[PDB]
Structure 1
């Protein structure tokens, strides 16, 4: 298997201070199998949710041949509002990833996006 998985996520997810949120991303792959230990919702620098979005959580289930990545959390009242680039990073059973760290960095430089990239919009 040399074909990488493909994530389907809303380009932008809008959340609000003092409120809970729940969104869903879907992942497919030619193999229909995934490495859940290597599937995460994270910011650019590490597998963490990120500064100012420390409360961003995720849960992974599989329904048929598709991953269902739940993107959820509760937004504290004292949150800094703004826009936060985050990523649904998914790995198939063979270790192919939807977006590499180099692809993510290149896209940030060029003000563009990679597969699985989305904006968490806090208002």
Structure 2
């Protein structure tokens, strides 16, 4: 005889093509113990467990144990996966977390955007470039801004790389004849650094 069901707090899970992700949901019951956590699409039934895409994974530690879902020490569900590079972008998936208390109460699924962040969350897939924000590097002084030579293009690409070590090693850095930088990430998405922040002349 428990009357309330476990409550969930999740978040805004933005994931990126080519990159791994890892988010956590916090679960608390009035009983202080939660015995089961399921993450699923709205389709199904009560015991449905279908979740798509298949690359979305979840895990929970310390299930079914007194006080593992208290306000002082919330139950935490790890939501993680690896987005493949061939995933469409424009794309988001609305999902549900269901938790179970010892008396059997299950989190109620409510199909409404007003629940996003709680037991309902959105997993938004974005392009790789949306994960990084390349930093303005060393200014590279060149002879002429309208005609960067090959070596000046290579020097600007090496300086951008030196300022941005977080950026995927496989990302390609190219510089044009007027000095604009193009960062092509592994999923072929693109970031571009203006020529006036990385290149200068004395004319």
State TM-score, norm by structure 2. 0.50
- Runs of at least 5 residues in structure 1 that lack an aligned partner in the other structure: none
SS in 2 for 1:80: coil
User: Could you tell me whether the CA contact under 8 Å between 1:49 and 1:55 is conserved in 2?
Assistant: no
The answer on 1:69 being equivalent to 2:70 is: no
The Cα offsets for residues 32-90 of structure 1, whole Å up to 9 and x where unpaired, read as 11122xx111111141221xx21100001138432110000000111123111011111
In structure 1, the partner of 2:29 is: 29
Q: What TM-score do you get using the length of structure 1 for normalisation?
A: 0.80
Q: Which runs of 5+ in 2 are unaligned?
A: 127-203
Contact 1:42/1:48 (8 A) holds in 2: yes
- Residue 93 of structure 2 corresponds to 84
1:122 is matched with: 125
Aligned-pair distance for 1:17? 0.6
Deviation at 1:16, TM superposition (A): 0.4
Q: Which residue of 2 aligns with 1:41?
A: 39
**Residue correspondences, number:** 111
Which structure has the higher relative contact order (CA within 8 Å, separation 6+)? 1
**Larger of the two Rg values belongs to structure:** 2
Please point out which of 104, 112, 131 is paired with 1:95. 104
On the 8 A contact 2:21/2:82 being kept in 1, the answer is yes
RMSD: 1.8
Structure 1 stretches of 4+ with a deviation exceeding 4 A read: none
